[PDB]
Symmetry: D2
Subunit: 264 residues, 4 copies
Amino acid sequence: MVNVKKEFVDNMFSVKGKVALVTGATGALGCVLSKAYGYAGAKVFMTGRNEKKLQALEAEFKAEGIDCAYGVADPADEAQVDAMITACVAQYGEVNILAVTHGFNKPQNILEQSVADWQYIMDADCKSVYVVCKYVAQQMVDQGKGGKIVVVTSQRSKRGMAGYTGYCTSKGGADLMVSSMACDLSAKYGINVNSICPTVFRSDLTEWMFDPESAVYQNFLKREPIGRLAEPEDFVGYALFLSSDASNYITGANCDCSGGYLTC
Amino acid sequence: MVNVKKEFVDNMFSVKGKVALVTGATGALGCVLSKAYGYAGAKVFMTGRNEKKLQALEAEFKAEGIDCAYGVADPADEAQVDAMITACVAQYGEVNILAVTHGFNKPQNILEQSVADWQYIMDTDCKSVYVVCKYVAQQMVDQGKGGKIVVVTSQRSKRGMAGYTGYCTSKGGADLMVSSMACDLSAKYGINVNSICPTVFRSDLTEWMFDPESAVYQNFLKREPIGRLAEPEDFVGYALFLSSDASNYITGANCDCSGGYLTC
Amino acid sequence: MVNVKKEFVDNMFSVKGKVALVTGATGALGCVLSKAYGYAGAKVFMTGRNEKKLQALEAEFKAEGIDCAYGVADPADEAQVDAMITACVAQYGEVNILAVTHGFNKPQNILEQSVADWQYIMDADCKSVYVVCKYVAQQMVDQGKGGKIVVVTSQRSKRGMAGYTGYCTSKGGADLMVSSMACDLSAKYGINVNSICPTVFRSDLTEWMFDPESAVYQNFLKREPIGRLAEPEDFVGYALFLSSDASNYITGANCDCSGGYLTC
Amino acid sequence: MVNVKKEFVDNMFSVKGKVALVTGATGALGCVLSKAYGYAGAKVFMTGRNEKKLQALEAEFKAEGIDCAYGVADPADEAQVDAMITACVAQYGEVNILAVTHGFNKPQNILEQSVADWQYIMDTDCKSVYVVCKYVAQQMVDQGKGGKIVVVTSQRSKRGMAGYTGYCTSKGGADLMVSSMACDLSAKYGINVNSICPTVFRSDLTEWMFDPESAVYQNFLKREPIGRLAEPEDFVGYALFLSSDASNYITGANCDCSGGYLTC
């Protein structure tokens, strides 16, 4: 008999009954991923800094029968992250999936960007990934059931850009932090750690879309073999795949969500 | 309201009712992927050179209610591939998914490997990918409904190896052929083209596993953050993901199925 | 005392008295590299298919005191390559450096490109690299003095492009063939094998430069952090570096000559 | 006539009369690069934190007719870096080449590595690269004559490793910071910015070389197509190449100094 089971294939993409902790939950990708986990049957614990926006999401999701909760925390603040994970464990008993979607950018040329401004991006966008991953991984180790970590980086983790010495250092570094975390955790504890590297969202560029003096929209479109800019919903499939049994062998990968921008 | 639909999330990983054409169908990965597509509800058209082995698979799958058929063809032979696609279209009406799993290798140092031996690997392992992709892409264009192509390459498409001047040229080339095919087809025709880059299967190395003189098994294990060698079933999730609506934005990618070998 | 010698530093970039065999010697990069090796004091053996163009180069170089010779050969023809290397050995006693610059392209979409047209690119652009490298490496092994091989690929060895299923397969494959050849030859025989991955030459695009309907020139310029397209002379430094003692530790590398196109 | 000049070829690798500022000058690679620039005729300005070790190097180099000087500075401290560059400008009139060789590592698994310990590596190894590059680039801009920046990263900038969540984030980030700096500076100001990615030095592993319980030495040797571990002198050629006219077109590159570790 061929070495594949029907039970495996039918349920491999499931996240049903799993507890998914989503950071940057009020952001463009974070709110979409949080709802997608909910629609897929996971218990959703949303975190971010804006309580009013988290409350609005919790009300919308609960009206559709999604089991969800939220915790306010600055992801770069070690004490707040620890308390937030404790609140998730108190609510749901465990953490099975972590989706890291928070971040920050402020593009500026190196000559005009102070060391403090560069450090601000690194703390908000890079240190915060270490803090959240370290504390959630420790919780997954404590549980002894393995787990899944999905870090949203950027196609900027592999390609530089003018004005991006902060963001590219942060994302370039996070991709390697993910591969090193897989080396630290996957074999011993059954914790898969992967990143997704998306291109830009259409909605991020619509503001200057009608400006003939701007080349930004067309510079991206010339470099998108898929033929269009991304929507957050375009990455829910990859995120859920990397959060399910279907990706049990996959670890330390930096997954291409660029629509071909990285390979053309 | 958050921009993601429940109907999208519930059905995004489906391949139900789709016609999946699988090359190298009698091989270790090919038979597993063929059955996985069948268990997932796709109509499966298997192709390979060994009729007796294809007949055995068809009998096994039909006994489990899988709708499948086969066609004998040498994938490097345009005329045989063209006739094989015609037989798939006659049986099922169309081709929606293509999974390319066939191949050949015969490692040998460049000094001892004749130009004819190198060419034999290139024809069997590389030219055959161009032939199958070109003819199936043309059928998908003719249909006007888009489609999915998944080419199985190898982690050897990105890392060289002693004795692999044939296989590494073929796989390294196929990864770029996939990115270029996405540039040719995805925007205009809605045909996504991606590759998966697997590490070795545990069963491929079981022969010399007990020989202390061989370092092969341990060479790979030291370089596998996941902590074990692969089974064909470990790649069914990625292959089905890349064959479904869940990956509609993903094209021209060379997906890391190495278990961390590529990133450590 | 610091572990570096003055004699080493003063002479590390030298190719003086070395025999450099350059393929595609009559082409834009080939003629420039051949003359640069000559100006740097190497004995230059030029090869290509056009005898009149090789004779013109030999006359120009000899008028400037360069020790050079030529041999006519189709680089994909195993018998002609063997005879050409024999003629170089008869003239100069040995081969120390090989620079592979020949090639062919004919861009065409996969749907319109016949299997025979794809194969034509592969034979002219990829098989020919295997033939030349195998025979020159065998000669270097026979000599027992090590050697240097520099293969000119393209930035297309790492990035796909519409119409390039032939060229990208050939260059993508050649980069991996180089890494595998380093695995086969460098430790045992002291033969370093590396590739250089250039961007396009300014002169290749000047024809359609005044056509407003063409985006080619600007598509490249937007993606060149260096701020201009390349001239063949821009790659002589990297080629000579990879042909000298200064790069003795460097092997199996695919060197970025893209002017930042690969990293932005 | 072939488009290459003899005067260009004869002098392209020269750093004679150029002012080379070397950070981490007392380290294994820093002292070797500092002396190599000196032997090549550059004016050498060495910086580091250990005054006694800088004084010993200055005395050794002056005894061999090298024009050199030193300045004590912590490279992560903007005020000290600014004062150090002022002292280099006062001594030599300008800065033409910058070689960044300093760094820090303390491997530790993520579960046992505090956020403060991770931050310590990031400040010492990553923030310090931003500080030095920003201040030296500003000095090169002020001069208006262009310049060369060579950042020494590691093969760890592209491959993760157990215990390296700090170092891999720092090096992975620095490679992207270099590509982004090239986008910010090369076209407008003629400042090329590149990195070199070395493998480990033989001397770094000699301690546990005789311990059968340690796999480290053999783990690297199995992955070195060149056939041996590196010496600092093995990277002087690449560093001087990237500091000379021979590499004028090369910018934003992350150069492979791994001996094939990256490509096998």
